Design a binder for this molecule. Sequence first.
Ligand SMILES: [Mg+2]
Ligand SMILES: [Mg+2]
Ligand SMILES: [Mg+2]
Ligand SMILES: [Mg+2]
Ligand SMILES: [Mg+2]
Ligand SMILES: [Mg+2]
Ligand SMILES: [Mg+2]
Ligand SMILES: [Mg+2]
Ligand SMILES: [Zn+2]
Lengths: 304, 71, 177, 120, 152, 173
Amino acid sequence: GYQPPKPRFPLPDSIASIVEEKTREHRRSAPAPPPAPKLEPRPMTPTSLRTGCIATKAGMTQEWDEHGVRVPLTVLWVDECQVVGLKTRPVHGYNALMLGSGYKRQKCMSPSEAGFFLKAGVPFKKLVAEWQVSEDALVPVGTAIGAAHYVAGQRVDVTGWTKWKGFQGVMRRWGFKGLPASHGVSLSHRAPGSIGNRQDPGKIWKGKKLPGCMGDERRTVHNCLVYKVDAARNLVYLRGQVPGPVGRSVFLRDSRLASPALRASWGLPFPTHVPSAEELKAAPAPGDVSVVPAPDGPGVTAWR
Amino acid sequence: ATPKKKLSLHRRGNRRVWYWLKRKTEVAKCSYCGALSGRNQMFSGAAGNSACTGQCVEQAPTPPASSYPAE
Amino acid sequence: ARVRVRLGDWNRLNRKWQHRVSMMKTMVTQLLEKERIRTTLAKAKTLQRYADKVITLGKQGTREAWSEARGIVRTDRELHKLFTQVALRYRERPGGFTRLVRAGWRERDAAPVAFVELVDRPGELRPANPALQRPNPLSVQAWIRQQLGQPAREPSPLLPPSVQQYLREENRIQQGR
Amino acid sequence: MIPKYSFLKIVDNSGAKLAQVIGFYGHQGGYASVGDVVKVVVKEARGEKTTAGVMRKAVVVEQKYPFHRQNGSHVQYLRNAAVLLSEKGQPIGNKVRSMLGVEFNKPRWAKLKSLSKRLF
Amino acid sequence: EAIKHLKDLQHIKLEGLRFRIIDAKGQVVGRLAEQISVILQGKDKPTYNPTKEQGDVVIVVNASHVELTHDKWNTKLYRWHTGYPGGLRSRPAGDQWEKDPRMLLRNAVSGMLPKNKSREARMEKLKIFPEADHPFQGFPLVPYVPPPRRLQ
Amino acid sequence: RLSLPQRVLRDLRPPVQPYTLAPKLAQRPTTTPAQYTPWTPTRALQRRAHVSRRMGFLMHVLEREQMERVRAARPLPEFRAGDVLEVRMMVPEAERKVVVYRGVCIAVYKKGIRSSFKIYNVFPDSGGVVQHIPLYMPDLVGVKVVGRIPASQERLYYLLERETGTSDYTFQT
RNA sequence: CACCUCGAUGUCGGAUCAUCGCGUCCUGUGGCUGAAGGAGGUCGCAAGGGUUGGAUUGUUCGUCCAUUAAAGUGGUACGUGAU
RNA sequence: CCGCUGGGGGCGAGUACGAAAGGACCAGACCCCUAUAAACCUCUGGUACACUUGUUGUCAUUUACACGGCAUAGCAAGAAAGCUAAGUUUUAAAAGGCUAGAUUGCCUACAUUCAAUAACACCGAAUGACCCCGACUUACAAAAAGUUUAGGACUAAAUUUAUGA
Ligand SMILES: [Mg+2]
Ligand SMILES: [Mg+2]
Ligand SMILES: [Mg+2]
Ligand SMILES: [Mg+2]
Ligand SMILES: [Mg+2]
Ligand SMILES: [Mg+2]
Ligand SMILES: [Mg+2]
Ligand SMILES: [Mg+2]
Ligand SMILES: [Zn+2]
C-alpha cells in the first residue's frame, strides 16, 4: 500500500561535497534539546490541553444515586499507564506525550520494540499511544497516569474499537429496509435494491453502501460523564456505554466537545495528579479498599 | 453474467493467482527412513510409513503394571 | 449458525444433535473396548471431552451413575470395564484421562486425522505423569496448604492401612449374613 | 406500546367500551405509553349517549407492555386501557370505573387522582 | 526551519544541469511562469532534444512578492474534483494564498509544461520559496534576471 | 560504571500484613479462595493470567462488595418464588413516602446486585397488576412473608390466566 | 422532423436505495410594509437536512380523514425488472 | 478524502406591546420528548436443538424400578452465556473517522505449533507455560469465575520431572 518510492539517482556531478558540508554544519548548529520537564502542580491556563489515558474496559454494572435512580455504569481499569516518550516543539514538529499501558514479557515482544523500552528505562508496555498536549503539560518519562488524573462529574470522550461481527449485509450494516416477505417477491427479501441510476450516471458512486466486513472500527462516544473514581484500585466508573469488548483497552481524554475553556468548573489537576507522599504506599500486597467521590446533580424527579 | 470478449494469456495468468499454493517453510525429517512430515504429526509405522524401522523412537521401556482384566 | 467453537460448546460434526450424541456414545464405547481409536480432529476433540465426562461418571460407582451409563454406553461387556478396570485405573486422576496425537490426513477426503488413546495403560505411547505428587512437608507448598484450607491429597494404594485395623477384626465380618 | 389502529377498552362511564387509536399528538412516531393523550375513535357503544362512530380524545392509563420507572422497577398491567378526555384536558366521565382504573399519576392529572378507585 | 533546510537538500533528480535563481519581486505570475517553463524544458540550450529530458534546477525566491493583476485575487478560482458525488471543490486565489502561497506560481508553471509523463521530473526541478533565502547557499547557481518589464 | 536500583525498583517495599497468602477483601464464595486481587497488581507483580479472565473476576468482586454492603445496611428474609409477600417500598416519585404492597411473588428473577422479584396482585376491582422490583435497590425498606402456597414450578407465569378471585391480597380502596 | 438503433433492446406504476440543481414548504435569515409585536403579503441571501399517515381509484393524476415546522417542485432513457 | 452538526413544546413571559381581546421576537442557556447517526447488553424483554422439570404413544427392559431409541428438540413449561431491539447511553465552532505520509526512535525479527473457516489470538500463548482442555466448588451465577499442571502446545542434567500457575 505505498507508491513506487524513489528513483534515487546517485551521481551529483560533484555537488555532493557542498551538500555533505551543509548537512554537517546543519546538524551541529541545531539547538540542544530542552531539559527534562520535572513537573510539580501547575496553573490552569484556559487554552491548555491535557493528556489522555489508556484504560481497559472491564464490563458494566448497576448503581443507584442518592436521589434513587439506576445508572448504567461501565467500569474501566487503568493498567499502570505511564509516560514512555516525549515530543516537543524545538526538537520535534509538535508537542505530545507518548503513553504506555499493560505489560508484556521480553520473549513476547518484537526485539525492535523491546529496545525502545529498554533505552527509555520503562517496563515493556503492551500498547503505546500519544496525545497532543500544551507546552506546560509535558510530564516527564516514567510518570504514572492513573484514575486520579480524572475527577467525578467530569465529561470524557472515550475512544474504542467496536466488537467484530464479520461480514454482514445492508439490512443491519446500513439499516436498509428490504422487500416484503410474501407478495410475489422472488429471491430478493434482503436485496440492497437499486444501486445506480441508469445510463446518465452510468456508474456506481464512490461512497455506495454495499455489504462488507464491519467490526473493529474506531468509534468515539462523545461527552460521557464520570460517576466514580477509585484512586487506590485505578477504577473509573463512566455512565453509559463504551465501544469495544471487555478486556480491550480504550482511550480517554477531557471532552473537547464541551469546551468553553472554563472546563465547566471541574476540579481537574492540570499536569496530572502529582502525588504527595508517594512513600508509605504499598506494592501489590494485602491492601484493602479506599474511599471514592461521586457527583449528585439536581432534581431528577422535579415533577411528574 | 457472460464474458463479452476472450480472456488473453496475460489476463488469465493474473486472474489465476488465487489458485497457486504457498511453499511450506518447515519440515520434520526422520534421519533413519528419510520420511518427511509436519513437526506436530506422527509419521511412524502406526501412521502411514512403510519405510519405518522403529529407530525413529529411540527408547521405550515400560514393564510394570497391575490390573483386573475383565473376562 | 449458533456459535459452538469460539464460545465453548460441543462441536456439531456435520450432524443433527440426536445423531451427534449417538455417534459419540458409539465412539466412547469403542474407545474403551479398544483403548486407542483413530479418527478426524473434530470427532477426536469431541471424543476427548465426552470420555472425561463418561469416565468420571464411572468413577462415582453409584447406582444412579450405573443407570445413566447404561443408556450412554452401549456394549455392556464394556459397561463392566468402565465401572471396574477404568474406575480403579483412574481413581485418583483429576481429569485428562485421554491424549491426542495427530497422524496426518486420510486418503478418501484429505481430512486431518488424530490418534486418541487412554493414558496410563500398558501399550500407551508416552509415559504418563502420576496423578498425585507426594509433597515434601519441608517445602513452601505444604505450609501454604496448611495456612490455607487444602487437604493433604497424597498418593494412596487401593486399600490404605487406615482400613486395615477395621478389616482385620473377626467381629466385623457378620459371617457374610 | 400502543401502535396506531390498535384497540383498547375505555373504562369510565362516558359511553365507550372500545376505541381505535388513529393518531398521536406529539412527535412520538413509534408507540404510545401510559400518561399520553391520543385521538381515539369509538367503535362500539355501551348503548348510552356516546353512540358508536365518534372521534374523541383519550389518555392511556394502563398497558400490557412493561412501564419502566427511573428507580429500576416497572409496572405490568394485564389489560390495555384508556380514559376519554375533553377539549379542556378533563375526562367527560363522572368517575374512572374501578373495573380497570388503577394507575401511577401525579403530573397535573390531580383531577384523575379523584376519578380512580385507587392510585399506585 | 531546522529540518526544512535538510530535506530540500535531498535530491531525487539528475544533477548534470545548471542551477538558476530568480527573484520574484514585482514579477507577474503569468510571465514569470512562462519564463520558468522555458527554462524548465531545456529549450534555452542549443543541444535540445525532445526525447532527452534536460533542463535546469529553477530556484524561485520571494514567492509572496507576486501579484495578480485586475481583481484576480477574489475572482480567479482553483477547481478540482474528488471522484465522489458532489465533489467539486473550488478555492479562490486569496484562500489559495492563505492555504499555501507558493501554489499560485506552482499551478501556473504546471499548466504550461507539456502534458506527458516527463512532467513529474520537470516539476521536481521547480523549487519555490516564500521568503528571501534558500537552502542552496553554497551551491554554484547562476541568476536568471528576466528581460526588463517596461515594454509598456 | 554506576550500577544503582531505580525508583521503579522502590516498589520492593515490605507488605502491610506480614503473613498473607490469600489476598483477603475477596467477596467470592466460601471455598477454593483466590490468590490474587483483580485490581491492584497490573502485571507488575502477579501470577499472570489473561485480561477478561481478570476484569470478569473484577466485576464479580465489585458486585459482591456492594451486595454485602447493602445486606449489612438492611437484612432480608430467605424466601422462595411461590409465596405471598408484603413489600415496604418508598416511592421516589412521591416525597419518599412508604407505601405497602401485597401480592404473591411469581419469581425470584435474578442473582447479584441485579437480583429481582415479581409480586402479582389481582385487584378485585381492576384485575391483576404485577410489579417488578429490584431486590437491592435503596428504595426497598423491608419485606416479610405471610402466605405460603407450594408450587413445583419456580416461575409462576401460569397464574396470569388462572382463577383471579383467589389472587386477592390488597383492595386498598 | 424522421437523424439513431427493427441480426427483436422495460416505458404510462410503486417497493427498496440513490445523486444533483433551486424557481425554498420548513428550519437559518435581511428589506419594504396599509408594520399594534402576533398573524400575513411580497422581495433579497442561503440547498446543511427534514418533508410523516393511510382510507379509495391499475392510476404518476386527484381529493378528504389529522396529525407536523412542513406534508416542495424538477433533471435523473418524466432515476431505478442481468435487484 | 468522507461524514458533518434535525427539530418541536416549555422556562424566559400573563410579559415589551396592547382601550382591549390577543400574545412575541433571543434559542442565548436549562427541562422534556422525538428523529438520524454511532455503539453496548447494565436494566427490561425475545431466542437459545448435547440445560432442567412434567408427560403421551410405541420398541427395547428374565422388575412394565431407574436408564435408552423414534414420533418437528414428540409435546409443554422454565432457563445461563452469546446475539438482538421494542431496551440503554452519546450525538456544539473543529468535533469525529479513512488512506498516504517529512520526520524521530529502535532492531538478539528466515517464521513453525496450540483444531480443517483466529472472527477466540496478534492490545493471546508454547513448559520460569493457566494459552487451551479436563477435574473440583459455587442457588448469595438457573454457571463464569476461583483452585489445580491431570491431558495438549516436547525438554532437558553436575543442587530439584522444573514459577510463590
Ligand atoms: Mg419465477
Ligand atoms: Mg447456516
Ligand atoms: Mg429426532
Ligand atoms: Mg448478561
Ligand atoms: Mg443451558
Ligand atoms: Mg428404533
Ligand atoms: Mg446474524
Ligand atoms: Mg502436560
Ligand atoms: Zn523413520
